Structures are given as structure tokens and as C-alpha cells.
Amino acid sequence: GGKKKVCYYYDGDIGNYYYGQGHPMKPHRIRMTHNLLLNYGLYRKMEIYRPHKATAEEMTKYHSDEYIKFLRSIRPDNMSEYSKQMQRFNVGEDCPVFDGLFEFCQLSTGGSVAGAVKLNRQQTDMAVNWAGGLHHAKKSEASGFCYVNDIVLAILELLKYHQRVLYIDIDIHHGDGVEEAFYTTDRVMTVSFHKYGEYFPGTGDLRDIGAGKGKYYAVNFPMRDGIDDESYGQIFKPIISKVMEMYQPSAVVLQCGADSLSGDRLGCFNLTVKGHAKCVEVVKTFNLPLLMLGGGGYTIRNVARCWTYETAVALDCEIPNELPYNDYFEYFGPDFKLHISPSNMTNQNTPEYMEKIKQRLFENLRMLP
Ligand SMILES: O=C(CCCCCCC(=O)Nc1ccccc1)NO
Ligand SMILES: O=C1CC[C@@H](c2ccc(Cl)cc2)N1
Ligand SMILES: [Ca+2]
Ligand code: NA
Ligand SMILES: [Zn+2]
Incomplete structure (x- = not known):
């Protein structure tokens, strides 16, 4: 179906937001991803865009006015005045209050929505926002390190020109917020x-x-x-x-x-x-407008490797296993290669289990009109 045009959304500020000491979500992983793929030369082959900061107007296409007003107001220095609201909207534990939290949501969301608009206008085949994929956020509630559901907002943008949109989620966690919205x-x-x-x-x-x-x-x-x-x-x-x-x-x-x-x-x-990237490859073969987004990922050297390789897959661009020098090179020791080895942990998913679940899902799909 040809090589595809890829537009890629990145704001260099994203890596400076900090969830706090001990929190496993590290936005810095997006900056590592970006720097690795720049050093492989992949900017030569795709358009790189800085996303706009999504406004409250954009966010309230899904989220409640009350929830968005709270995200716009809450800061580490006024938290004690917002104790009740923090509990109502599930902020302050998995989803802490940090400096610039609302700007961080605006950047994540902006990329996903800008990508969807670019697809709607048929100016690209694929849009990539590695800072997106916040699949747990709900209408009026933060969840699972997510505050604003960029995916839901991006799909609502696609629904303006597309009767039917397919969402696929290969994150290890269930995409409950997206499933609930739709x-x-x-x-x-x-x-x-x-x-x-x-x-x-x-x-x-x-x-x-x-x-x-x-x-x-x-x-x-x-x-x-x-x-x-x-x-x-x-x-x-x-x-x-x-x-x-x-x-x-x-x-x-x-x-x-x-x-x-x-x-x-x-x-x-x-x-x-x-193995992960084979999923990208499979979806690409259907030759449909495709928005590709990030998600969870907590061993950050491997997140950077994964999303770098998946950018290369989107571009049908072969890159060597030997990592190029980059600003985070030491994080990729001791091997300094792109690809990783599986562990020897036991697979609890038997062949029989996998086939049985697949057959149950095929029965459900026979019920579509
Ligand atoms: O990856 C995700 C979000 C995962 C949310 C996991 C919440 C449970 C948890 O481990 N919380 C936690 C761990 C360490 C420190 C603070 C909170 N979605 O795809
Ligand atoms: O690096 C980042 C950017 C957005 C934020 C995040 C939070 C939750 C999920 Cl599930 C995915 C991504 N972290
Ligand atoms: Ca999943
Ligand atoms: Na649905
Ligand atoms: Zn996850």
C-alpha cells in the first residue's frame, strides 16, 4: 500500500514534568525516545510538529466542566484548600498534584487532537503522539496516572469525518476509560x-x-x-x-x-x-488512517527502544541494532543495542487458553450486522 506519510508530535517541555520522588511514571522517557530517534536520523523521513496546548473548550468535549476547572486550579501550594475535590476527582495518590500539571495535560492532549485533525484533513496517513495514550482518565475522574483522556478526545475529533473508528490497545493494562466512553x-x-x-x-x-x-x-x-x-x-x-x-x-x-x-x-x-512492534506492522497493513499513541512504560530504556523502533516501522525504515550515540547513551548499557531479549519467566498463557479465548471472541464478532 506504499510507504506512508508520517506526522510526529513532540514538545521538548514534556520531559521536564515530574510526578514526584518514587513515582514510576517518568515523562522524561518521551525526551529519551525523541533523542534516540533523532540520532538514528528518522527526522529526515517524517514531519515533526510541536502540538498546541489543548484548551478547556477542547477538553470539555468529553470531560466535565467541574473536573477541568479543578485541573486548571489545583497546585501543590493550594492542595489543602481542595481536599474534598481531590478525593472526588481521584487526585493525590496514583495521580499526584505536581507543578505544571494542567500544562502537562494540555501538551499530551494537544498532540493527539492535532494528529486526529491532520488525519481528518487527509494531510497524513499516520500521526504519532508518544506523549499520548492516557487510556484510564474518565469524564470526571483521574485514574492510573492519567488526568485527561487524549484518546477519547482524539476519537471524538475523528468521528466528525469517520462513521466508524477502531481503537486497539496493546498496553498491558485494560483501556477502561476509552471503553467506558464508547x-x-x-x-x-x-x-x-x-x-x-x-x-x-x-x-x-x-x-x-x-x-x-x-x-x-x-x-x-x-x-x-x-x-x-x-x-x-x-x-x-x-x-x-x-x-x-x-x-x-x-x-x-x-x-x-x-x-x-x-x-x-x-x-x-x-x-x-x-513482538510489540509486530502489532504496529499488522495494523499498518490495513492501509487506514492511523493515530499511534504511547501509554504506560516504566523501564524507560526499553520504552525509548520500543517507540523508536515503532516510529521506524511506521516509516518502513530499517535501522541498525547498534544504538547510535545519544544524550542518554549510558541508560542503554550494558549492551547498547536497540532490541531486547525475553526473560525466562514462565508463560502462564497456555496455547489452549489462547485459542479458547480467541474462539469466544470470534463468536461475539459473528454477532455484528
Ligand atoms: O500503565 C498504566 C497505569 C498503571 C497504574 C498503576 C497504578 C498502581 C501503582 O503501581 N501505583 C503506584 C506505584 C508506585 C508508586 C506510586 C503508585 N496504564 O497503562
Ligand atoms: O510520559 C508521559 C506523557 C503522558 C504521561 C502518561 C500517563 C499515563 C499513561 Cl497510561 C500514559 C502516559 N506520561
Ligand atoms: Ca491493553
Ligand atoms: Na463501543
Ligand atoms: Zn499500562
């Missing part, structure tokens, strides 16, 4: 692959399939610890192909959370960067 519509189908059982956020059962006009338009593939490239690859392509055949979306949003990689600090999957 649970009762058939105009967005949500497909999430995730660890399920005794794991954040606790949602995404096989049996959660949508409601009302959205019944059968939510798809959940629950997995156990230790899934590897071969097991994941054998279910992802057939599920996504069946979804494409039955749902026939005209645009796609792919959340590429890198916490499904081997060695992630919060994750317990065993995927390599090649």
Missing part, C-alpha cells in the same frame, strides 16, 4: 489486550462486550503473566483481521503502551520490541 455506541469499537486478574484497573473481562447500541462493540482479551512474542502474535493478527472484516472502520487509533515488554517495572509480560 461502551454504548457502535461508532467506536474498542479492542483491548491486557493482563487480567489481581491487576490494575480490575476491568476488561472477556464477558464485557458493550451495552445498548454498543453491544458486541467492546472486545476484551484477558491474559495471564508471561506472554511471549509467539503467543501474542498468534492471537493478535487473527483477532484484528476478523475485527477489520466485520467492523470495517475508516480510521484506527492504536495505543502502544510499552509496559507489555519483558522487564517492565510494573508489567509481567515477556514481549520483545520486535
Whole structure:
């Protein structure tokens, strides 16, 4: 289907926001990603855009006025005056108050929405916002280190020109906030692959399939610890192909959370960067307008490797395994290579389990009109 035009959204301020001592979410990982892919020369092959800061107007296309007003007001120095509101909107633990929090949301959101607009106008085939993918935020509530749901806002922008949008989520966590926003519509189908059982956020059962006009338009593939490239690859392509055949979306949003990689600090999957990136490759083959977004990812050297490689995949541009010098080179020791090895952790997802869950999801997809 040809090489695709790629537009890529980055603001160099993003890496300066800080969740606080001990918090595993490190926005600095976006700056590492950017610097690595610049040093591989990938700027030669794509348009690089600085996103606008999304306004309250943009954000309240989904989020409540009250919740957005609170995000705009709350600061480390006025927290004690906002104790009640902090509890109502679930801010102050997983989702702390930090300096510049609202500007941070504006930058994340701006990239996703700017990308969607660029796709709507047919000025690009693919838009990339690695600072996006905040799949847990809800209408009036922060969750899971997410405050504003850039994905939901980007999909609402796509729905202006697209009757049917497909969302795919390869983050190790269930994309509960996106699924919830679109649970009762058939105009967005949500497909999430995730660890399920005794794991954040606790949602995404096989049996959660949508409601009302959205019944059968939510798809959940629950997995156990230790899934590897071969097991994941054998279910992802057939599920996504069946979804494409039955749902026939005209645009796609792919959340590429890198916490499904081997060695992630919060994750317990065993995927390599090649295994993860094979998902990008599969989605690309359908030749649809594609918004690719970040997500979780807590071993930051591997997040940088993952999203650098996935940018190269979007560009159909082969890059060497030997890392080029970069500003964060020491983080990539002791090997200084792009690709990673899986661990020897046991895969708890048996072949039989994977095939059985796949067959249950195929039965649900036969129920589309
Ligand atoms: O990656 C994510 C968000 C994961 C949210 C995990 C919340 C539980 C947790 O580990 N919280 C925590 C850990 C260390 C320090 C402070 C909070 N979504 O894809
Ligand atoms: O590096 C970053 C930019 C946005 C922010 C974030 C928070 C939560 C999720 Cl799930 C994904 C991304 N971190
Ligand atoms: Ca997921
Ligand atoms: Na839906
Ligand atoms: Zn995650």
C-alpha cells in the first residue's frame, strides 16, 4: 500500500514534568525516545510538529466542566484548600498534584487532537503522539496516572469525518476509560489486550462486550503473566483481521503502551520490541488512517527502544541494532543495542487458553450486522 506519510508530535517541555520522588511514571522517557530517534536520523523521513496546548473548550468535549476547572486550579501550594475535590476527582495518590500539571495535560492532549485533525484533513496517513495514550482518565475522574483522556478526545475529533473508528490497545493494562466512553455506541469499537486478574484497573473481562447500541462493540482479551512474542502474535493478527472484516472502520487509533515488554517495572509480560512492534506492522497493513499513541512504560530504556523502533516501522525504515550515540547513551548499557531479549519467566498463557479465548471472541464478532 506504499510507504506512508508520517506526522510526529513532540514538545521538548514534556520531559521536564515530574510526578514526584518514587513515582514510576517518568515523562522524561518521551525526551529519551525523541533523542534516540533523532540520532538514528528518522527526522529526515517524517514531519515533526510541536502540538498546541489543548484548551478547556477542547477538553470539555468529553470531560466535565467541574473536573477541568479543578485541573486548571489545583497546585501543590493550594492542595489543602481542595481536599474534598481531590478525593472526588481521584487526585493525590496514583495521580499526584505536581507543578505544571494542567500544562502537562494540555501538551499530551494537544498532540493527539492535532494528529486526529491532520488525519481528518487527509494531510497524513499516520500521526504519532508518544506523549499520548492516557487510556484510564474518565469524564470526571483521574485514574492510573492519567488526568485527561487524549484518546477519547482524539476519537471524538475523528468521528466528525469517520462513521466508524477502531481503537486497539496493546498496553498491558485494560483501556477502561476509552471503553467506558464508547461502551454504548457502535461508532467506536474498542479492542483491548491486557493482563487480567489481581491487576490494575480490575476491568476488561472477556464477558464485557458493550451495552445498548454498543453491544458486541467492546472486545476484551484477558491474559495471564508471561506472554511471549509467539503467543501474542498468534492471537493478535487473527483477532484484528476478523475485527477489520466485520467492523470495517475508516480510521484506527492504536495505543502502544510499552509496559507489555519483558522487564517492565510494573508489567509481567515477556514481549520483545520486535513482538510489540509486530502489532504496529499488522495494523499498518490495513492501509487506514492511523493515530499511534504511547501509554504506560516504566523501564524507560526499553520504552525509548520500543517507540523508536515503532516510529521506524511506521516509516518502513530499517535501522541498525547498534544504538547510535545519544544524550542518554549510558541508560542503554550494558549492551547498547536497540532490541531486547525475553526473560525466562514462565508463560502462564497456555496455547489452549489462547485459542479458547480467541474462539469466544470470534463468536461475539459473528454477532455484528
Ligand atoms: O500503565 C498504566 C497505569 C498503571 C497504574 C498503576 C497504578 C498502581 C501503582 O503501581 N501505583 C503506584 C506505584 C508506585 C508508586 C506510586 C503508585 N496504564 O497503562
Ligand atoms: O510520559 C508521559 C506523557 C503522558 C504521561 C502518561 C500517563 C499515563 C499513561 Cl497510561 C500514559 C502516559 N506520561
Ligand atoms: Ca491493553
Ligand atoms: Na463501543
Ligand atoms: Zn499500562
